[PDB]
Design a protein around this motif. Structure first.
Motif, mmCIF file in Angstrom:
data_model
loop_
_atom_site.group_PDB
_atom_site.id
_atom_site.type_symbol
_atom_site.label_atom_id
_atom_site.label_comp_id
_atom_site.label_asym_id
_atom_site.label_seq_id
_atom_site.Cartn_x
_atom_site.Cartn_y
_atom_site.Cartn_z
ATOM 1 N N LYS A 32 0.825 -1.210 0.000
ATOM 2 C CA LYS A 32 0.000 0.000 0.000
ATOM 3 C C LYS A 32 0.844 1.237 0.000
ATOM 4 O O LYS A 32 0.497 2.227 -0.658
ATOM 5 N N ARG A 33 1.918 1.192 0.753
ATOM 6 C CA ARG A 33 2.779 2.379 0.901
ATOM 7 C C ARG A 33 3.660 2.527 -0.333
ATOM 8 O O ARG A 33 3.668 3.586 -0.968
ATOM 9 N N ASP A 34 4.388 1.500 -0.695
ATOM 10 C CA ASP A 34 5.316 1.607 -1.851
ATOM 11 C C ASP A 34 4.624 1.707 -3.198
ATOM 12 O O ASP A 34 5.169 2.342 -4.087
ATOM 13 N N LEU A 35 3.457 1.089 -3.393
ATOM 14 C CA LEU A 35 2.675 1.283 -4.646
ATOM 15 C C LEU A 35 1.873 2.557 -4.645
ATOM 16 O O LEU A 35 1.249 2.908 -5.645
ATOM 17 N N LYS A 36 1.788 3.219 -3.505
ATOM 18 C CA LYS A 36 1.079 4.467 -3.408
ATOM 19 C C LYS A 36 -0.383 4.310 -3.763
ATOM 20 O O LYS A 36 -0.993 5.205 -4.337
ATOM 21 N N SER A 37 -0.967 3.206 -3.305
ATOM 22 C CA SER A 37 -2.364 2.881 -3.609
ATOM 23 C C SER A 37 -2.981 1.986 -2.548
ATOM 24 O O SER A 37 -2.444 0.936 -2.240
ATOM 25 N N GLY A 38 -4.112 2.419 -2.005
ATOM 26 C CA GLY A 38 -4.895 1.594 -1.114
ATOM 27 C C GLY A 38 -5.350 0.279 -1.742
ATOM 28 O O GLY A 38 -5.546 -0.687 -1.028
ATOM 29 N N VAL A 39 -5.543 0.285 -3.065
ATOM 30 C CA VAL A 39 -6.035 -0.834 -3.839
ATOM 31 C C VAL A 39 -4.905 -1.354 -4.692
ATOM 32 O O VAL A 39 -4.314 -0.596 -5.485
ATOM 33 N N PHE A 40 -4.528 -2.620 -4.482
ATOM 34 C CA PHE A 40 -3.382 -3.176 -5.122
ATOM 35 C C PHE A 40 -3.575 -4.714 -5.267
ATOM 36 O O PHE A 40 -4.441 -5.285 -4.682
ATOM 37 N N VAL A 329 -14.332 -12.691 -8.153
ATOM 38 C CA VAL A 329 -14.898 -11.701 -9.063
ATOM 39 C C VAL A 329 -15.520 -12.403 -10.321
ATOM 40 O O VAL A 329 -14.783 -12.827 -11.186
ATOM 41 N N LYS A 330 -16.851 -12.424 -10.430
ATOM 42 C CA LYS A 330 -17.547 -13.057 -11.572
ATOM 43 C C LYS A 330 -17.740 -12.083 -12.740
ATOM 44 O O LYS A 330 -17.836 -12.511 -13.858
ATOM 45 N N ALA A 331 -17.782 -10.775 -12.454
ATOM 46 C CA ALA A 331 -17.936 -9.723 -13.432
ATOM 47 C C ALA A 331 -17.185 -8.581 -12.841
ATOM 48 O O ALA A 331 -17.242 -8.383 -11.629
ATOM 49 N N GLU A 332 -16.490 -7.835 -13.686
ATOM 50 C CA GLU A 332 -15.618 -6.748 -13.212
ATOM 51 C C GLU A 332 -16.273 -5.657 -12.406
ATOM 52 O O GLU A 332 -17.393 -5.239 -12.704
ATOM 53 N N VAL A 333 -15.549 -5.155 -11.406
ATOM 54 C CA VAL A 333 -16.039 -4.133 -10.566
ATOM 55 C C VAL A 333 -15.122 -2.945 -10.605
ATOM 56 O O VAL A 333 -13.915 -3.099 -10.705
ATOM 57 N N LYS A 334 -15.708 -1.760 -10.589
ATOM 58 C CA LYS A 334 -14.987 -0.534 -10.479
ATOM 59 C C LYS A 334 -14.736 -0.296 -9.019
ATOM 60 O O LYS A 334 -15.688 -0.306 -8.242
ATOM 61 N N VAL A 335 -13.486 0.006 -8.691
ATOM 62 C CA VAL A 335 -13.121 0.402 -7.333
ATOM 63 C C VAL A 335 -12.204 1.615 -7.384
ATOM 64 O O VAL A 335 -11.022 1.522 -7.841
ATOM 65 N N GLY A 336 -12.753 2.763 -7.049
ATOM 66 C CA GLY A 336 -12.029 4.033 -7.224
ATOM 67 C C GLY A 336 -11.709 4.262 -8.682
ATOM 68 O O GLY A 336 -12.571 4.194 -9.546
ATOM 69 N N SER A 337 -10.459 4.499 -8.993
ATOM 70 C CA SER A 337 -10.104 4.716 -10.389
ATOM 71 C C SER A 337 -9.712 3.408 -11.089
ATOM 72 O O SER A 337 -9.277 3.405 -12.255
ATOM 73 N N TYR A 338 -9.854 2.284 -10.402
ATOM 74 C CA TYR A 338 -9.451 1.045 -10.975
ATOM 75 C C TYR A 338 -10.664 0.177 -11.329
ATOM 76 O O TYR A 338 -11.782 0.353 -10.836
ATOM 77 N N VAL A 339 -10.353 -0.781 -12.135
ATOM 78 C CA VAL A 339 -11.277 -1.857 -12.427
ATOM 79 C C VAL A 339 -10.648 -3.164 -12.012
ATOM 80 O O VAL A 339 -9.514 -3.457 -12.380
ATOM 81 N N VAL A 340 -11.380 -3.955 -11.254
ATOM 82 C CA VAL A 340 -10.896 -5.255 -10.789
ATOM 83 C C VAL A 340 -11.500 -6.308 -11.701
ATOM 84 O O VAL A 340 -12.743 -6.430 -11.775
ATOM 85 N N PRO A 341 -10.667 -7.095 -12.392
ATOM 86 C CA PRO A 341 -11.192 -7.941 -13.464
ATOM 87 C C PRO A 341 -11.732 -9.293 -13.013
ATOM 88 O O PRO A 341 -11.311 -9.878 -11.958
#
Ligand code: 26N
Ligand code: HEM
Ligand code: CL
Length: 444
Positions: A32-40, A329-341
């Protein structure tokens, strides 16, 4: 558009097994810290696992429906324990009906005689096991014994307990549990490896279900309101009765779910409260409970123990027994600026989110008076439609144990510091050989 950032992988077969296995708390904060993203994203043996470690984004994990974020596929290792067609393994609507039926057996309507049942059993335990004026005990073990003994006293009628006592139940649950391979959630192929001895999960569950069958036959003969009796009145919307196979499964779920989580929550709570630096908190615990009668009731535990509740909730906040909850994940979800596939496991981590510096400043500090500074950041008992159904019952148990134990005894930890968490078991608690404590019976 964008995939969450993936922590760099240097060994493809393993992904991040080594670093995540060794110390999940450090490794998830590092990503989280080194990627600079809560979502990783990390890799467990090549399976993508996307972690929603930003508490502002918790609802993107907890809100989507089952057909989008599906728990079934993550928990197929439980099928031999709960049973085919049971819980996760049932179609989603039926799963929901079954879990709702079990939740009704654990609401406040059912609690009016639980406090004295719990208390009577705790006192029996202490009288049997904490006999002298002072003695050394393993607290994690004893809390464990009190959790199973108390839950049985609350949930099972005397006829059931004559066929299936707490020790015998404990042995059945242990055989079901020791068959499980937690990592097979991410690497199903692990089920192909040879075992050191034959598993006994299927035999143990069969024996439980056979005992319950026999109890039912007998009750039917003699002409009602324990857990078993309540689930026997369950009728689905299709007009069909919950089957013996399903009732057995919900009963296993109930006992299985509590056995380590409640034990650990009790143990941690006592471990902080007895530590010298937390004297102010133990004094505040005594102020709250010192005017209680010897025979506690529902109101004392439910309404008149707010500080002790905060102690229990903060022990879970700091050291959550379940470090992560997962969905396929059965269908992609948007989480913040990302999409989780599609195909990722997505997870929300009580361990990670409870160490978020915004939501929980100084998170390794045990502070029963803290509040979350980001709404919904505390997820020790999950959230949304899959939120914990055992949470009220568990807290009723723990608080009753605390009020009883600290009334009759003082405790001293036999080491300088509250235990380290042992992250090597699927339910995480204090390191067992660190939980030696000295009790001293108080002058009455
Ligand atoms: O304890 C568990 N499951 C039972 C049973 C249960 C499941 N669904 C339920 C739903 C309701 C009731 C009971 C249950 C339970 O009792 N759950 C519960 C649920 C709700 N309330 C109370 C209790 C449980 C705990 C953890 C878990 N993993 C944790 C981390 N993993 C992992 C793998 C590899 C690595 C490494 F490779 F090293 F990198 C690192 C970490 C693997 C998965 C899996 C678990 F199945
Ligand atoms: C301190 C003790 C406990 C902790 C910390 C705990 C934690 C949790 C968490 C984090 C979840 C969310 C799971 C997810 O979203 O996938 C949950 C759900 C659940 N818990 Fe617990 N739990 C505890 C005790 C119990 C008890 C005593 C029961 C007894 C029945 C129980 C039964 C469940 C069930 C059935 C769910 C399922 C919700 C679902 O998928 O619909 N838990 N719990
Ligand atoms: Cl089965």
């Amino acid at each position: 558009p964008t995939d969450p950032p993936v922590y760099p992988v240097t060994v493809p077969f393993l992904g991040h097994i080594v670093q995540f296995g060794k110390n999940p708390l450090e490794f998830m904060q590092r990503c989280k810290r080194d990627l600079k993203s809560g979502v990783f994203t990390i890799s467990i043996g090549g399976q993508r696992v996307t972690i929603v470690g930003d508490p502002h984004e918790h609802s993107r994990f907890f809100s989507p429906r089952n057909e989008i974020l599906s728990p079934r596929e993550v928990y197929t290792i439980m099928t031999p324990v709960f049973g085919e067609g049971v819980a996760y393994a049932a179609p989603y609507p039926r799963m929901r009906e079954q879990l709702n039926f079990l939740a009704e057996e654990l609401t406040i309507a059912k609690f009016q005689n639980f406090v004295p049942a719990i208390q009577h059993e705790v006192r029996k335990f202490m009288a049997e096991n904490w006999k002298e004026d002072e003695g050394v005990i393993n607290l994690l073990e004893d809390c464990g014994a009190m959790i199973i003994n108390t839950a049985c006293q609350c949930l099972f009628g005397e006829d059931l307990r004559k066929r299936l006592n707490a020790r015998h139940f404990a042995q059945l649950l242990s055989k079901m549990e020791s068959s499980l391979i937690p990592a097979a959630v991410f690497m199903p192929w692990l089920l192909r490896l040879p075992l050191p001895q034959s598993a006994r999960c299927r035999e143990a569950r069969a024996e439980l279900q056979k005992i319950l069958g026999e109890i039912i036959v007998a009750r039917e003969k003699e002409e009602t309101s324990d857990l078993l009796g309540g689930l026997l009145k369950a009728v689905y919307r299709d007009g069909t009765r919950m089957s013996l196979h399903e009732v057995c499964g919900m009963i296993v779920a109930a006992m299985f779910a509590g056995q380590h989580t409640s034990t650990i929550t009790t143990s941690w709570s006592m471990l902080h409260l007895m530590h010298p630096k937390n004297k102010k908190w133990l004094d505040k615990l005594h102020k709250e409970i010192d005017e209680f009668p010897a025979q506690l009731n529902y109101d004392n535990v439910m309404d008149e123990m707010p500080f002790a509740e905060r102690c229990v909730r903060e022990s879970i906040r700091r050291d959550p027994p379940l470090l992560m909850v997962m969905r396929m994940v059965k269908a992609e979800v948007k989480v913040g600026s990302y999409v989780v596939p599609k195909g990722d496991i997505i997870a929300c981590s009580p361990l990670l989110s409870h160490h978020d510096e915004e939501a929980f400043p100084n998170p390794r500090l045990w502070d029963p008076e803290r509040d979350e500074k980001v709404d919904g950041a505390f997820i020790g008992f999950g959230a949304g439609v899959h939120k914990c159904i055992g949470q009220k019952f568990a807290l009723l148990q723990v608080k009753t144990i605390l009020a009883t134990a600290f009334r009759e005894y003082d405790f001293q930890l036999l080491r300088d510091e509250v235990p380290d968490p042992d992250y090597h078991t699927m339910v995480v608690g204090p390191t067992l050989n660190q939980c030696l404590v000295k009790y001293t019976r108080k002058k009455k």
